[PDB]
Protein backbone atom coordinates (compact mmCIF):
# COMPACT_ATOMS: atom_id res chain seq x y z
CA UNK A 1 0.00 0.00 0.00
CA UNK A 2 1.79 3.17 1.21
CA UNK A 3 2.99 5.01 -2.05
CA UNK A 4 -0.16 6.71 -3.49
CA UNK A 5 -1.96 4.64 -0.92
CA UNK A 6 -2.35 1.63 -3.35
CA UNK A 7 -3.99 2.69 -6.64
CA UNK A 8 -7.41 2.52 -5.03
CA UNK A 9 -9.90 5.18 -4.17
CA UNK A 10 -9.95 4.57 -0.40
CA UNK A 11 -9.12 1.42 1.74
CA UNK A 12 -5.92 -0.72 1.44
CA UNK A 13 -4.38 -3.88 2.96
CA UNK A 14 -1.17 -5.87 2.36
CA UNK A 15 -2.29 -9.40 1.27
CA UNK A 16 0.91 -11.40 1.25
CA UNK A 17 2.65 -9.07 -1.31
CA UNK A 18 -0.21 -7.38 -3.06
CA UNK A 19 -2.38 -4.41 -1.88
CA UNK A 20 -6.07 -5.38 -1.42
CA UNK A 21 -8.02 -2.29 -1.78
CA UNK A 22 -11.67 -2.22 -0.81
CA UNK A 23 -14.42 0.46 -0.37
CA UNK A 24 -16.61 1.89 2.36
CA UNK A 25 -20.26 1.09 2.82
CA UNK A 26 -22.17 1.18 -0.35
CA UNK A 27 -19.39 1.62 -2.80
CA UNK A 28 -18.80 -1.26 -5.22
CA UNK A 29 -15.10 -1.75 -6.30
CA UNK A 30 -14.34 -1.53 -10.01
CA UNK A 31 -13.31 -4.42 -12.33
CA UNK A 32 -9.81 -2.97 -11.75
CA UNK A 33 -9.54 -3.82 -7.96
CA UNK A 34 -9.16 -0.06 -7.40
CA UNK A 35 -12.16 2.29 -7.78
CA UNK A 36 -15.29 2.35 -5.51
CA UNK A 37 -18.44 3.44 -7.42
CA UNK A 38 -21.09 5.41 -5.61
CA UNK A 39 -24.06 3.38 -4.59
CA UNK A 40 -26.55 5.68 -3.05
CA UNK A 41 -27.42 9.18 -4.48
CA UNK A 42 -26.19 11.05 -1.34
CA UNK A 43 -23.37 8.74 -0.01
CA UNK A 44 -20.91 8.84 2.88
CA UNK A 45 -18.27 11.45 2.90
CA UNK A 46 -19.42 13.56 0.02
CA UNK A 47 -20.95 16.99 0.41
CA UNK A 48 -22.07 19.23 -2.46
CA UNK A 49 -24.59 19.68 -5.32
CA UNK A 50 -24.69 18.98 -9.07
CA UNK A 51 -21.96 19.20 -11.51
CA UNK B 1 -16.22 26.25 17.69
CA UNK B 2 -13.87 29.15 18.58
CA UNK B 3 -12.36 30.36 15.19
CA UNK B 4 -12.83 28.89 11.67
CA UNK B 5 -15.49 29.82 9.05
CA UNK B 6 -19.19 29.15 8.98
CA UNK B 7 -20.08 26.06 6.80
CA UNK B 8 -21.65 26.89 3.45
CA UNK B 9 -24.36 24.77 1.65
CA UNK B 10 -23.03 21.41 0.77
CA UNK B 11 -20.36 21.63 3.41
CA UNK B 12 -21.12 19.80 6.65
CA UNK B 13 -24.07 17.38 5.81
CA UNK B 14 -23.24 14.77 8.43
CA UNK B 15 -23.94 16.98 11.44
CA UNK B 16 -26.68 16.61 14.09
CA UNK B 17 -27.69 19.17 16.64
CA UNK B 18 -28.96 17.23 19.67
CA UNK B 19 -31.51 19.84 20.84
CA UNK B 20 -33.34 19.73 24.20
CA UNK B 21 -36.82 20.07 25.90
CA UNK B 22 -37.66 23.43 24.35
CA UNK B 23 -35.46 24.64 21.41
CA UNK B 24 -31.81 24.92 22.49
CA UNK B 25 -28.93 22.78 21.22
CA UNK B 26 -26.46 21.41 23.71
CA UNK B 27 -24.33 18.84 21.97
CA UNK B 28 -23.49 17.49 18.58
CA UNK B 29 -23.51 14.28 16.65
CA UNK B 30 -22.65 12.83 13.28
CA UNK B 31 -25.30 11.23 10.99
CA UNK B 32 -23.92 7.75 10.66
CA UNK B 33 -26.73 6.36 8.55
CA UNK B 34 -30.45 6.97 8.48
CA UNK B 35 -31.17 5.44 11.86
CA UNK B 36 -28.24 6.22 14.11
CA UNK B 37 -26.47 9.45 15.21
CA UNK B 38 -22.94 9.15 16.81
CA UNK B 39 -22.12 11.27 19.92
CA UNK B 40 -20.06 11.60 23.14
CA UNK B 41 -21.51 9.73 26.17
CA UNK B 42 -21.07 12.74 28.48
CA UNK B 43 -23.74 14.72 26.48
CA UNK B 44 -26.31 12.42 27.94
CA UNK B 45 -26.41 14.33 31.22
CA UNK B 46 -27.35 17.95 30.17
CA UNK B 47 -30.64 17.16 28.61
CA UNK B 48 -33.96 15.73 29.09
CA UNK B 49 -35.32 15.64 25.50
CA UNK B 50 -32.36 15.14 23.07
CA UNK B 51 -34.58 15.89 20.05
CA UNK B 52 -32.25 15.40 17.01
CA UNK B 53 -32.69 18.27 14.48
CA UNK B 54 -30.94 17.04 11.29
CA UNK B 55 -30.74 19.68 8.55
CA UNK B 56 -30.14 22.78 10.65
CA UNK B 57 -27.33 25.08 9.50
CA UNK B 58 -27.80 28.55 11.06
CA UNK B 59 -30.10 28.15 14.13
CA UNK B 60 -31.68 31.56 14.50
CA UNK B 61 -33.28 31.42 11.12
CA UNK B 62 -35.39 28.38 12.18
CA UNK B 63 -36.86 27.93 8.66
CA UNK B 64 -37.57 24.88 6.54
CA UNK B 65 -34.75 22.62 5.59
CA UNK B 66 -34.08 21.19 9.06
CA UNK B 67 -36.06 18.44 10.89
CA UNK B 68 -36.10 17.30 14.54
CA UNK B 69 -36.26 13.52 15.06
CA UNK B 70 -36.83 11.89 18.42
CA UNK B 71 -34.91 8.88 19.52
CA UNK B 72 -35.83 5.29 19.97
CA UNK B 73 -32.68 4.14 21.96
CA UNK B 74 -29.40 5.47 23.36
CA UNK B 75 -26.29 3.11 24.11
CA UNK B 76 -23.15 4.43 26.12
CA UNK B 77 -20.01 2.12 25.88
CA UNK B 78 -19.84 0.28 29.29
CA UNK B 79 -16.43 1.36 30.31
CA UNK B 80 -17.42 5.08 29.94
CA UNK B 81 -15.68 6.34 33.01
CA UNK B 82 -17.70 9.55 33.79
CA UNK B 83 -15.15 12.19 35.15
CA UNK B 84 -12.55 10.52 33.03
CA UNK B 85 -14.29 11.00 29.69
CA UNK B 86 -12.88 7.70 28.67
CA UNK B 87 -14.65 5.54 26.22
CA UNK B 88 -16.89 8.65 25.81
CA UNK B 89 -19.21 7.36 23.12
CA UNK B 90 -22.82 6.57 22.30
CA UNK B 91 -24.63 5.60 19.10
CA UNK B 92 -28.35 6.42 19.35
CA UNK B 93 -31.30 5.15 17.28
CA UNK B 94 -34.07 7.42 15.92
CA UNK B 95 -37.70 6.62 15.24
CA UNK B 96 -37.80 8.38 11.92
CA UNK B 97 -35.14 7.84 9.30
CA UNK B 98 -33.14 10.40 7.58
CA UNK B 99 -34.12 11.28 4.00
CA UNK B 100 -30.83 12.69 3.11
CA UNK B 101 -31.16 15.82 1.03
CA UNK B 102 -29.37 19.18 0.75
CA UNK B 103 -27.30 19.31 3.84
CA UNK B 104 -27.95 15.68 4.96
CA UNK B 105 -25.66 12.73 3.76
CA UNK B 106 -23.88 10.13 6.02
CA UNK B 107 -20.23 10.19 7.08
CA UNK B 108 -18.08 7.09 6.40
CA UNK B 109 -16.49 5.11 9.12
CA UNK B 110 -12.97 3.88 8.18
CA UNK B 111 -11.54 0.46 9.07
CA UNK B 112 -8.90 0.43 11.82
CA UNK B 113 -5.63 -0.16 10.01
CA UNK B 114 -6.02 2.12 6.96
CA UNK B 115 -7.27 4.71 9.48
CA UNK B 116 -4.08 4.96 11.67
CA UNK B 117 -1.69 4.53 8.79
CA UNK B 118 -3.25 6.72 6.14
CA UNK B 119 -5.87 8.91 7.66
CA UNK B 120 -4.69 9.98 11.06
CA UNK B 121 -1.25 10.64 9.69
CA UNK B 122 -2.80 13.38 7.66
CA UNK B 123 -2.13 16.92 8.69
CA UNK B 124 -5.57 18.22 9.56
CA UNK B 125 -9.17 17.13 10.25
CA UNK B 126 -12.50 19.03 10.19
CA UNK B 127 -14.55 19.47 13.34
CA UNK B 128 -17.99 21.24 13.43
CA UNK B 129 -20.89 22.47 15.56
CA UNK B 130 -22.97 25.40 16.73
CA UNK B 131 -21.19 25.57 20.15
CA UNK B 132 -19.60 28.62 21.74
CA UNK B 133 -17.74 31.00 19.65
CA UNK B 134 -15.42 31.86 22.59
CA UNK B 135 -15.08 30.35 26.15
CA UNK B 136 -16.72 33.03 28.29
CA UNK B 137 -19.00 33.89 25.34
CA UNK B 138 -22.07 32.26 23.76
CA UNK B 139 -23.37 29.95 21.25
CA UNK B 140 -23.21 30.24 17.56
CA UNK B 141 -26.52 30.17 15.94
CA UNK B 142 -24.43 29.12 12.87
CA UNK B 143 -22.79 25.74 11.96
CA UNK B 144 -19.10 26.48 11.79
CA UNK B 145 -16.28 24.25 10.60
CA UNK B 146 -12.77 24.20 11.85
CA UNK B 147 -9.96 22.68 10.02
CA UNK B 148 -7.53 21.53 12.81
CA UNK B 149 -4.12 19.86 12.81
CA UNK B 150 -3.51 16.55 14.53
CA UNK B 151 -0.97 16.96 17.28
CA UNK B 152 1.42 14.27 18.56
CA UNK B 153 0.45 12.12 21.45
CA UNK B 154 3.75 12.62 23.32
CA UNK B 155 3.36 16.34 23.06
CA UNK B 156 -0.36 16.68 24.06
CA UNK B 157 0.18 14.35 27.08
CA UNK B 158 2.27 16.93 28.89
CA UNK B 159 -0.15 19.58 28.02
CA UNK B 160 -3.08 18.11 29.92
CA UNK B 161 -3.89 18.17 33.62
CA UNK B 162 -6.26 15.32 33.13
CA UNK B 163 -5.40 11.86 31.87
CA UNK B 164 -5.26 11.47 28.10
CA UNK B 165 -6.06 7.72 27.97
CA UNK B 166 -5.25 5.17 25.06
CA UNK B 167 -8.68 6.20 23.65
CA UNK B 168 -7.93 9.82 22.96
CA UNK B 169 -6.04 12.14 20.62
CA UNK B 170 -5.79 15.95 20.76
CA UNK B 171 -5.77 18.42 17.88
CA UNK B 172 -5.54 22.14 17.29
CA UNK B 173 -3.34 25.08 17.88
CA UNK B 174 -1.58 25.73 21.18
CA UNK B 175 -0.96 29.48 20.67
CA UNK B 176 -3.25 30.10 17.61
CA UNK B 177 -6.79 31.52 18.40
CA UNK B 178 -9.09 28.58 17.19
CA UNK B 179 -10.51 25.49 19.02
CA UNK B 180 -13.62 23.32 19.46
CA UNK B 181 -15.83 24.57 22.35
CA UNK B 182 -18.80 24.35 24.72
CA UNK B 183 -21.80 22.67 23.14
CA UNK B 184 -19.76 21.19 20.25
CA UNK B 185 -19.19 17.91 22.18
CA UNK B 186 -20.05 14.91 20.09
CA UNK B 187 -19.92 16.78 16.75
CA UNK B 188 -17.95 15.21 13.90
CA UNK B 189 -14.19 14.97 13.33
CA UNK B 190 -13.85 14.03 9.66
CA UNK B 191 -10.74 13.42 7.60
CA UNK B 192 -10.96 13.56 3.83
CA UNK B 193 -8.93 11.17 1.92
CA UNK B 194 -9.30 12.25 -1.81
CA UNK B 195 -12.92 13.23 -1.65
CA UNK B 196 -14.47 10.86 0.72
CA UNK B 197 -14.51 12.14 4.28
CA UNK B 198 -14.25 9.56 7.04
CA UNK B 199 -15.03 9.93 10.76
CA UNK B 200 -11.82 10.02 12.77
CA UNK B 201 -13.23 11.26 16.07
CA UNK B 202 -16.05 12.46 18.27
CA UNK B 203 -15.45 15.88 19.98
CA UNK B 204 -14.65 14.84 23.58
CA UNK B 205 -13.41 17.57 26.02
CA UNK B 206 -11.15 20.57 26.79
CA UNK B 207 -9.82 22.79 29.63
CA UNK B 208 -11.65 26.06 28.74
CA UNK B 209 -11.62 26.97 25.03
CA UNK B 210 -8.84 28.17 22.55
CA UNK B 211 -6.63 28.04 25.56
CA UNK B 212 -2.94 28.70 25.78
CA UNK B 213 -0.60 25.80 25.53
CA UNK B 214 -3.70 23.77 25.12
CA UNK B 215 -5.08 21.63 22.36
CA UNK B 216 -8.63 20.22 21.94
CA UNK B 217 -9.21 16.51 22.94
CA UNK B 218 -11.32 14.09 20.75
CA UNK B 219 -12.57 10.44 21.12
CA UNK B 220 -10.45 8.32 18.73
CA UNK B 221 -13.15 6.49 16.71
CA UNK B 222 -10.65 3.97 15.11
CA UNK B 223 -10.28 2.49 18.61
CA UNK B 224 -14.07 2.41 18.79
CA UNK B 225 -15.01 0.64 15.52
CA UNK B 226 -16.40 -2.80 16.26
CA UNK B 227 -18.36 -1.40 19.24
CA UNK B 228 -20.25 1.07 16.97
CA UNK B 229 -21.09 -1.75 14.51
CA UNK B 230 -22.12 -4.38 17.10
CA UNK B 231 -24.52 -1.76 18.47
CA UNK B 232 -25.32 -1.01 14.77
CA UNK B 233 -27.55 -4.03 14.73
CA UNK B 234 -28.29 -4.85 18.39
CA UNK B 235 -28.88 -1.50 19.94
CA UNK B 236 -30.13 -1.45 23.64
CA UNK B 237 -27.73 -2.63 26.27
CA UNK B 238 -24.09 -1.74 26.03
CA UNK B 239 -22.38 -5.14 25.49
CA UNK B 240 -18.97 -6.59 26.55
CA UNK B 241 -18.24 -2.93 26.93
CA UNK C 1 -16.52 20.48 26.51
CA UNK C 2 -15.07 22.69 29.04
CA UNK C 3 -13.89 20.35 31.75
CA UNK C 4 -13.21 23.25 34.05
CA UNK C 5 -16.82 23.65 34.83
CA UNK C 6 -17.18 20.42 37.02
CA UNK C 7 -16.01 17.56 39.36
CA UNK C 8 -19.30 16.27 39.83
CA UNK C 9 -20.10 14.68 43.29
CA UNK C 10 -18.49 17.11 45.81
CA UNK C 11 -14.89 16.09 46.49
CA UNK C 12 -14.41 16.59 50.47
CA UNK C 13 -12.34 19.70 50.63
CA UNK C 14 -12.37 21.76 53.70
CA UNK C 15 -8.85 22.87 52.94
CA UNK C 16 -8.10 26.45 53.85
CA UNK C 17 -5.20 28.34 52.01
CA UNK C 18 -3.64 27.45 55.38
CA UNK C 19 -4.09 23.83 54.27
CA UNK C 20 -3.38 24.48 50.62
CA UNK C 21 -6.84 24.49 49.23
CA UNK C 22 -7.36 26.47 46.09
CA UNK C 23 -10.54 28.40 45.75
CA UNK C 24 -12.38 27.55 42.55
CA UNK C 25 -15.88 28.11 41.28
CA UNK C 26 -17.15 25.10 39.73
CA UNK C 27 -20.65 25.37 38.51
CA UNK C 28 -23.32 24.52 41.09
CA UNK C 29 -26.70 22.97 40.75
CA UNK C 30 -28.09 25.02 37.92
CA UNK C 31 -28.41 28.76 38.00
CA UNK C 32 -24.81 29.71 38.77
CA UNK C 33 -21.35 28.88 40.10
CA UNK C 34 -20.24 27.69 43.65
CA UNK C 35 -16.80 28.21 45.45
CA UNK C 36 -14.92 25.19 46.75
CA UNK C 37 -11.48 24.99 48.52
CA UNK C 38 -9.81 22.30 46.61
CA UNK C 39 -7.59 20.16 48.75
CA UNK C 40 -3.99 19.63 47.76
CA UNK C 41 -4.29 15.87 47.30
CA UNK C 42 -7.28 16.36 44.99
CA UNK C 43 -5.72 19.26 43.07
CA UNK C 44 -5.31 18.15 39.41
CA UNK C 45 -3.56 21.39 38.75
CA UNK C 46 -5.96 22.59 36.13
CA UNK C 47 -6.30 26.33 35.48
CA UNK C 48 -9.79 26.51 37.31
CA UNK C 49 -12.19 29.51 37.47
CA UNK C 50 -10.93 32.04 39.85
CA UNK C 51 -14.21 33.80 40.18
CA UNK C 52 -17.95 33.99 39.90
CA UNK C 53 -17.75 36.40 36.93
CA UNK C 54 -15.63 34.25 34.63
CA UNK C 55 -17.05 30.96 35.66
CA UNK C 56 -20.75 31.95 35.26
CA UNK C 57 -20.21 33.52 31.73
CA UNK C 58 -17.94 30.64 31.04
CA UNK C 59 -19.90 27.74 32.41
CA UNK C 60 -23.43 29.25 32.36
From Swiss-Prot, chain B:
Disulphide-bonded residues: 7-12, 27-43, 156-170, 181-209
Residue numbers annotated as active site: 42, 88, 185
Residue ranges of domain Peptidase S1 in the record: 1-233
Name of this protein: Activated factor Xa heavy chain
Organism whose genome encodes this protein: Bos taurus (Bovine)
Residues of the full protein shown: 234 to 474 of 492
Curated annotation (Swiss-Prot), chain C:
InterPro entries listed in its UniProt record: Kunitz_BPTI_sf (IPR036880)
Keyword Disulfide bond tagged: yes
Record-annotated BPTI/Kunitz inhibitor domain positions: 5-59
Top-level lineage group: Eukaryota
GO molecular function terms attached to this record: serine-type endopeptidase inhibitor activity
Disulphide bridges: 5-59, 15-39, 33-55
Transmembrane segments: none
UniProt keyword list: Disulfide bond, Protease inhibitor, Serine protease inhibitor
Function: TAP is a slow, tight-binding inhibitor of blood coagulation, specific for factor Xa.
Extra information: The inhibition of factor Xa seems to be reversible and stoichiometric.
Listed name of the protein: Tick anticoagulant peptide
Source organism of the structure: Ornithodoros moubata (Soft tick)
Organism lineage string: Eukaryota, Metazoa, Ecdysozoa, Arthropoda, Chelicerata
Amino acid sequence: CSLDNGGCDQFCREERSEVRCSCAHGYVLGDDSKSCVSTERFPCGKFTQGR
Amino acid sequence: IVGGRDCAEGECPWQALLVNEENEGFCGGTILNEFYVLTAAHCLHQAKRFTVRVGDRNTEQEEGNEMAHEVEMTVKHSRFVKETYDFDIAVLRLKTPIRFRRNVAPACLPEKDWAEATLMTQKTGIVSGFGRTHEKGRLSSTLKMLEVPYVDRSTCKLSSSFTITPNMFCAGYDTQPEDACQGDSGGPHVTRFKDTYFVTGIVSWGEGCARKGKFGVYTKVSNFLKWIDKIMKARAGAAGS
Amino acid sequence: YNRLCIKPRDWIDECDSNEGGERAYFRNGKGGCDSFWICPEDHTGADYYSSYRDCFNACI
